[PDB]
Amino acid sequence: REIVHIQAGQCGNQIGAKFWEVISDEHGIDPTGSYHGDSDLQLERINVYYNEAAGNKYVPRAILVDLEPGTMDSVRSGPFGQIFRPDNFVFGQSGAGNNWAKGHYTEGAELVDSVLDVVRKESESCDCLQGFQLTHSLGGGTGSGMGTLLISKIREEYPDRIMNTFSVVPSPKVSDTVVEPYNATLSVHQLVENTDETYCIDNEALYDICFRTLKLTTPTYGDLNHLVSATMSGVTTCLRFPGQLNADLRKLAVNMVPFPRLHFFMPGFAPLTSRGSQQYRALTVPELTQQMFDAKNMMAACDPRHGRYLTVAAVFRGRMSMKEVDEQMLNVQNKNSSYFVEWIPNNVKTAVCDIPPRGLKMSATFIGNSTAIQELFKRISEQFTAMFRRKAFLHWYTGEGMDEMEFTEAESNMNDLVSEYQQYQD
Amino acid sequence: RECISIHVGQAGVQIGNACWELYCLEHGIQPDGHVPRAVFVDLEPTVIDEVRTGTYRQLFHPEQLITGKEDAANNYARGHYTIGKEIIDLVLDRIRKLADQCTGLQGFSVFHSFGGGTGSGFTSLLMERLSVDYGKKSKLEFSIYPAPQVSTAVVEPYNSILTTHTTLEHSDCAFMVDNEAIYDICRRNLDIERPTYTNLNRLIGQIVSSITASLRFDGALNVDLTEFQTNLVPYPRGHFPLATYAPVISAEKAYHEQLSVAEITNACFEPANQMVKCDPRHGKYMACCLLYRGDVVPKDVNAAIATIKTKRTIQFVDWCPTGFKVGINYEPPTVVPGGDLAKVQRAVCMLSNTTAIAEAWARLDHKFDLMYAKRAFVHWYVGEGMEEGEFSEAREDMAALEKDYEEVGVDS
Ligand SMILES: CC(=O)O[C@H]1C(=O)[C@@]2(C)[C@H]([C@H](OC(=O)c3ccccc3)[C@]3(O)C[C@H](OC(=O)[C@H](O)[C@@H](NC(=O)c4ccccc4)c4ccccc4)C(C)=C1C3(C)C)[C@]1(OC(C)=O)CO[C@@H]1C[C@@H]2O
Ligand SMILES: Nc1nc2c(ncn2[C@@H]2O[C@H](COP(=O)(O)OP(=O)(O)OP(=O)(O)O)[C@@H](O)[C@H]2O)c(=O)[nH]1
Ligand SMILES: Nc1nc2c(ncn2[C@@H]2O[C@H](COP(=O)(O)OP(=O)(O)O)[C@@H](O)[C@H]2O)c(=O)[nH]1
Ligand SMILES: [Mg+2]
Ligand SMILES: [Zn+2]
User: Fold this and answer.
1) Contact between A381 and A411 (Cβ < 8 Å)
2) Is B194 close to A45, i.e. CB distance below 8 A?
3) B residues 186-245 near A, CB within 8 Å?
């Protein structure tokens, strides 16, 4: 099987560097080097993310889409930056304006064809394609607009292969941009209707989880990114490993989406202990479920405790008892019968790889489909209206060839999306 | 004389590798000896690959190892219809190529995992295409039906109410081994909170050895495969008996091993030892096939059973005077060199049809409704060449399986 990553925008891009920083080491691939793999198993399934050309050069099969040179020229001028074949860099030296409209209708719409071109060169690579990984932020141009287009096109070209989306939904407390809800509401819209698996991460849900669950005092972006990339590795790549009970994107999809919206999840990693001290090793297993299922530790902003779950997928990856795994999951399902929805006898989807995260003994990625994420699109949707009402920075959109009915559309859509999700919380 | 076997679904393949292990182990045929007599099907390469990479690597022909690099999908539909279809031909071909090479066979011991994609769906049509190509044989499918509370897949029931209805009108005798109810045995009758799948497999890998292996093997009271279905199914519904083993004692902890027949047979009817969460909560047995192996005196049996026939609290069906098929083999069991199985010199792999499953099916049917009641993951099948028909019409199916297993009992 296979997949083809997609680094839309700067963020989605910045993260690319971290997702590939990791993944590679979790596959023994040095900058341009080959497979130094401490083992021999980190190779029989690599294909999922690379391509064979030389014999020591397995190049990441991702796409780097962005209308701001400097960015990709920071990712390509640093560490692992020199492993991507230049063909991968689909830049847009234009003005990468922070407008969803500027990267979806006017500026991005041009650079698109020169992207799809490659997304096809990579898809028609070899063997059988599974789906595409998509990273980006719903709070900017090259991210929400242009990346949200990249998919609307992808999903017309292969409505068969899957589409996981890793979105950095606009954090609450403080917005790292101003129109944010504009660029956001507009991209979520496109998401709820193309990709079929979305993993929403919040820069501040991370800080928290990174400053209190990792006594880490100076959580640089690199970190946040790093933590995130840690989860997306547990998801995909991982399951493309052996296991007593293994799954793969689809299983994950076909066990997690009760209703076609596409629904968004909230990823959570397992061993998340501070370096030295904490290295408690309390990782027998009840310790991992202890972790994963708590409020804090959910990369999302919202707290599960604020709304039932529809599905859950503990994708563990480290030798354990299909008994102490299958078992724990249960008590968990009974101690919290309250929030776990009922019309699904077994919400949880236990998954079990074998080999764990390179240096760790036992981990377990968590992919939750809780109704709690209602209380986020609400947020976003609110911010919109409060500012849409006055058409705040709307001239930067319309003036870019947009529509007063376009914004209406998205909000509503994504706004209805909130509605539905409640239809199950009850 | 023989009995081919088709291990379908990752699980049916893991269990397969296991049951297949125990085999050579008690036949003195190391890694590289003769030639198996089965096949392996899966729509996820990486798993059958485990049989291609791991142990018992060269004991198979890359011809009896079928794979569909494509996608597994934990959904019946896709595995049965859409994808699973493409492979079937090829699959069949082997069970027609392997079915020819032999000499007057008896049937195909099928190994699948009820609630899976490749295991539920696919087989559904595999057994389907068999019942027509060899209606004149035995179709005993050995299943691992849905843990009563510890299921895995979110949809499981969708996949198991569908493998039951499609296979029902095609199997001869469906053996059942409950994944969870086997754990209990690993906790309560062997002690270990560290049971790897690789163990449950060693277990069924045992109970199964008692079925084919040893039985098709000479003895003081041989029992052919046909024998089963005959002495085991009272009615055409591909009736599903339950597998049970007796000396499930730990090869470390306790040691009373020397547990004469009189004991090991009583240890079969206590509900805490039956590889199935179908505790005889009321289910009246209606036929049991006590397969013994090792040093056993026919009188010991034709007495140990007599004592039972008169315990009454073990209430057998009405319309059934005597429902005890005593199968005696010679060669004692054969435990893994150093797993965790005791290793006695006699065992009792008793299987049976019990009005008990009236439960197990019930509890699994109900599940289904809850979700169907909201269509839950329905769009996943529809979009895979299925319809509101196949679901609703396979629900009605089992409905008359809840009435069937009710009527054939509870009444006189
Ligand atoms: C001596 C020793 O055992 O060190 C550990 C360690 O101290 C701890 C604290 C690690 C450490 O992780 C962090 O401090 C961290 C930093 C930024 C963001 C997130 C986490 C570690 O850096 C991370 C590193 O993780 C791995 O090696 C995994 O394979 C992981 N790899 C990466 O994230 C990675 C990092 C740099 C470069 C390339 C990859 C992984 C996890 C999931 C999927 C794929 C890969 C490990 C076990 C450790 C150190 C090295 C200190 C922990 O994290 C992980 C992801 O394992 C933090 O809590 C866990 C518990 C570990 O015990
Ligand atoms: N006893 C036993 N049960 C197993 C084993 N592997 C899986 N199972 C059980 O069988 C079911 C899992 O089926 P899956 O592995 O998801 O799927 P599959 O049937 O192989 O086919 P796909 O869905 O297409 O992958 C669960 O109920 C597991 O508890 C095994 O090795 N032994
Ligand atoms: N986790 C994370 N968030 C980022 C990174 N870079 C920008 N962001 C977030 O992305 C939003 C800004 O969008 P941006 O990526 O600049 O848009 P674009 O570059 O025009 O497509 C803010 O909410 C930031 O917190 C990053 O490297 N990691
Ligand atoms: Mg499988
Ligand atoms: Zn003794």
Assistant:
1) yes
2) no
3) 186-187, 193-198, 200
